[PDB]
């Protein structure tokens, strides 16, 4: 799931080079694929980077924190099972009930972040139903993230890249393994498209613009 950014960059290059909003008749609806709907995405997030780090919630109700020291702590949706990731990327699986005294500080912080998100924030894509075996899938963690004047970029450990636009609340979820893109528009409508089909049928200026922006963002992730 490492070399996935370069695949995503190639997929984006391909779609953007085809100038999808410049077709004779763009038939975006023909590029839709319900089978390509992602299993995981960031439904909530909090920036506390000045002192602690970034807290986030995934759509399965699991919470995670990417601390300033570049370590990660993830609490599974059961509210007891924990995953701790060191800077090197080494994973450790523990529980709140039987936790090392070494993680007491970081667990307390995660619980504050979890409680903040629950009390204050709206769940993105709350209406989406999970598939028959999705619950057994490996729970991803937040590898890296950054902010711009226009959006927040979230890079997950499973290779997926999420871009949340600030002004209009639109969101992109790029999955390189499925070569697909999920777009959540201003009306909160959730649509998943195959990138090879957007090349074939085209898309609206709105989505085409976000995809050009996404290419710039993926380039930044690769250069970092």
């Amino acid at each position: 799931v490492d070399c996935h950014l370069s695949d995503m960059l190639q997929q984006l290059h391909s779609v953007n080079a085809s100038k999808p909003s410049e077709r004779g008749l763009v038939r975006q609806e023909e590029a839709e694929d319900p089978a390509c709907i992602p299993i995981f995405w960031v439904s909530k997030w909090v920036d506390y980077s000045d002192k602690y780090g970034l807290g986030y919630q995934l759509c399965d109700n699991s919470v995670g924190v990417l601390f300033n020291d570049s370590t990660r702590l993830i609490l599974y949706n059961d509210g007891d099972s924990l995953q701790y990731i060191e800077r090197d990327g080494t994973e450790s699986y523990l529980t709140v009930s039987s936790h090392p005294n070494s993680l007491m500080k970081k667990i307390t912080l995660l619980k504050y972040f979890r409680n903040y998100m629950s009390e204050h924030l709206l769940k993105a894509g709350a209406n989406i139903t999970p598939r028959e075996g999705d619950e057994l899938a490996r729970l991803p963690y937040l590898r890296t993230w950054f902010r711009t004047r226009s959006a927040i970029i979230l890079h997950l450990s499973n290779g997926s890249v999420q871009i949340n636009f600030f002004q209009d609340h639109t969101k992109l979820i790029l999955c390189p393994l499925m070569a697909a893109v999920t777009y959540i528009d201003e009306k909160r409508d959730f649509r998943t498209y195959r990138l090879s089909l957007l090349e074939e049928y085209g898309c609206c200026k709105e989505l085409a613009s976000r995809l050009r922006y996404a290419r710039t963002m993926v380039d930044k992730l690769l250069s970092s």
């Binding site: 960031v42 909530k44 997030w45 909090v46 920036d47 506390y48 980077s49 000045d50 903040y116 204050h120 924030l121 709206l122 993105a124 902010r147 927040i152 949340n164 609340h169």
Partner: peptide, 12 residues
């Protein structure tokens, strides 16, 4: 309670 730097969409 100190408010965060930024956050996702707040509830209504």
């Amino acid at each position: 309670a100190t408010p965060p730097t930024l956050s996702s969409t707040v509830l209504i």
